[PDB]
Design a protein around this ligand. Sequence first.
Ligand SMILES: O=C(Nc1ccc(C(=O)N[C@H]2c3cccc(O)c3C[C@H]2C(=O)O)cc1)NC1CC1
Length: 167
Amino acid sequence: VNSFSGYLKLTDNVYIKNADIVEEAKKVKPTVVVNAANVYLKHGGGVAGALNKATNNAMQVESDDYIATNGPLKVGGSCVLSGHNLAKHCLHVVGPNVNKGEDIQLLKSAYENFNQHEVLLAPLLSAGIFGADPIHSLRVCVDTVRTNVYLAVFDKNLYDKLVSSFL
Ligand SMILES: O=C(Nc1ccc(C(=O)N[C@H]2c3cccc(O)c3C[C@H]2C(=O)O)cc1)NC1CC1
């Protein structure tokens, strides 16, 4: 039993809610919040920009030190950093960005990172300004992630469409 509230059950292990991941994180303080990162950990817009703003830019400062030491991530890859005031840890996951012409096949690899964590609060990967098909991303999520995932979807119209079309 955990403290996630008002999520709709999609599968054995995947739940979904129309909610601001910033607010869900502040309320639940999950062990892991997932960021929809890019390979440079430049948290400019979308989920990444919103989470970073909620940390008062501490996420970006930490991220810049990470990149200076380790270099960029891979598309489909991830790293674990602090969750700051939002969570114990932040799992920065790089899903493919279609508006950069990135390989949508890499979305499954991106979701595989979630399997290293028993429970996660996460956004739907590669949706919103990443420009991939969100129905496809949800199918990939449910077919790839085996651990317990609580998906927070900011856009109300998107959430309604995802629920109504889910097989
Ligand atoms: O600003 C905020 N929250 C805030 C939360 C989410 C987003 C956002 O862009 N989400 C979309 C996106 C963008 C990029 C990659 C993704 O995987 C997704 C999922 C998709 C969605 O969930 O609809 C933007 C802002 N909170 C302030 C305290 C009020």
